[PDB]
């Protein structure tokens, strides 16, 4: 019940979001 | 603000109701107090609706009772008994209420000698000349004191000087052996 509180990172795999540049 | 979920009296839900009509002849404690019930409910959940005529044939001062039978199943020595009343009288008589306890071998007592009634005073919300209101409770031993009787409890309404006229309201009363579950938004 540690991870269950925090929405995953989806760090595995390639890049999905192209939005024009770096966005925090 | 936060909702207050605790109450001194919780009126029965959808059950134990009865409407009383006609005349109601109050009486002095020296005599036999009128138990205006033949259809006396008893889950010690009772809601009696009043739409009668307060008639002073006998005494000009006195009282009448609305009763309900106590469930004697519980092994607990005594439990709480709450009542909630709202009565508007046409004729100024300054009503007054309270909880009472009395035994009887009979299943449907039509009246009870004043000497056989036990009293339990309660916070009376209002006591104007024409309306008495109260919602409170009291502790009462629930087991039959005299082997073989049934135990009754209810509210009694008295007056120092009654006045012939119509009376209307609700006399609710219950023995707490269950607290009605309720939706509490934050749980």
């Amino acid at each position: 019940m540690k991870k269950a509180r925090r929405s995953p990172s989806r760090r595995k795999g390639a890049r999905l979001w192209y939005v024009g540049g770096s966005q925090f | 603000m936060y909702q207050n979920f605790v109450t001194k009296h919780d009126t029965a839900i959808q059950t134990s109701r009865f409407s009383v009509t006609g005349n109601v002849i109050p009486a002095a404690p020296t005599g036999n107090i009128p138990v205006i019930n033949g259809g006396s409910i008893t889950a010690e959940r009772a809601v009696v609706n009043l739409y009668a005529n307060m008639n002073v044939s006998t005494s000009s001062d006195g009282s009448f009772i609305v009763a309900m039978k106590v469930d004697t199943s519980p092994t607990d020595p005594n439990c709480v008994i709450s009542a909630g009343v709202n009565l508007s009288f046409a004729g100024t008589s300054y009503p007054i209420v309270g909880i009472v306890r009395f035994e009887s071998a009979s299943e449907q007592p039509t009246s009870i000698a004043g000497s056989e009634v036990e009293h339990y005073p309660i916070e009376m919300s209002v006591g104007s000349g024409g309306v008495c209101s109260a919602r409170d409770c009291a502790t009462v031993d629930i087991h039959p004191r005299t082997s073989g009787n049934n135990v009754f409890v209810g509210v009694i309404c008295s007056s120092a000087k009654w006045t012939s006229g119509r009376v209307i309201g609700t006399i609710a009363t219950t023995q707490v052996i269950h607290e009605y579950q309720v939706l509490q938004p934050l749980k």
Binding site: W17, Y18, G20, G21 | -
Partner: protein, 144 residues
């Protein structure tokens, strides 16, 4: 581009500007002006296949730009070059930390609150910037 803190509105000035939600399908769409079709003119009855070829190439440069090279610095990186932070006047990021904020629940214990809970989030954290050399006068700002 507000000129003075006084040009800022109530909320902004007191709490800071608003930022983007964490990235997801609906909060990280391709820039709104993304091309959905690229037209190429053609003589009434023929098409210059050589031009068509160039047309695509040109498009490619346009796309790359829209999708991820909107900032000058990123275009130059595209060529395998680089730019000082002075080139486009970008603040220099010295240290970036991130962490989850967890805590505990407080149990309700009175007649009506029994069986109720209140979440108290309380997280400890370290944010450490390694010895940095300040080449010119300025400010070291740290934000959350």
């Amino acid at each position: 581009t507000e000129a003075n803190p006084s040009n800022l509105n109530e909320d902004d000035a007191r709490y800071g500007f608003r930022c983007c939600h964490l990235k997801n399908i609906w909060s990280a769409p391709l820039p709104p002006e993304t091309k959905l079709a690229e037209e190429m003119g053609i003589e009434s009855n023929s098409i210059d296949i050589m031009g068509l070829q160039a047309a695509y190439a040109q498009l490619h440069t346009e796309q790359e730009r829209t999708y991820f090279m909107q900032r000058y610095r990123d275009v130059i990186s595209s060529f395998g070059g680089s730019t000082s932070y002075d080139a486009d006047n970008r603040p220099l990021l010295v240290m970036h930390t991130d962490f989850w904020a967890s805590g505990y629940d407080v149990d309700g214990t009175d007649q009506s609150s029994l069986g109720q809970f209140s979440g108290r989030v309380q997280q400890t954290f370290k944010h450490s910037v390694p010895r940095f050399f300040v080449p010119e006068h300025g400010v070291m700002m740290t934000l959350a």
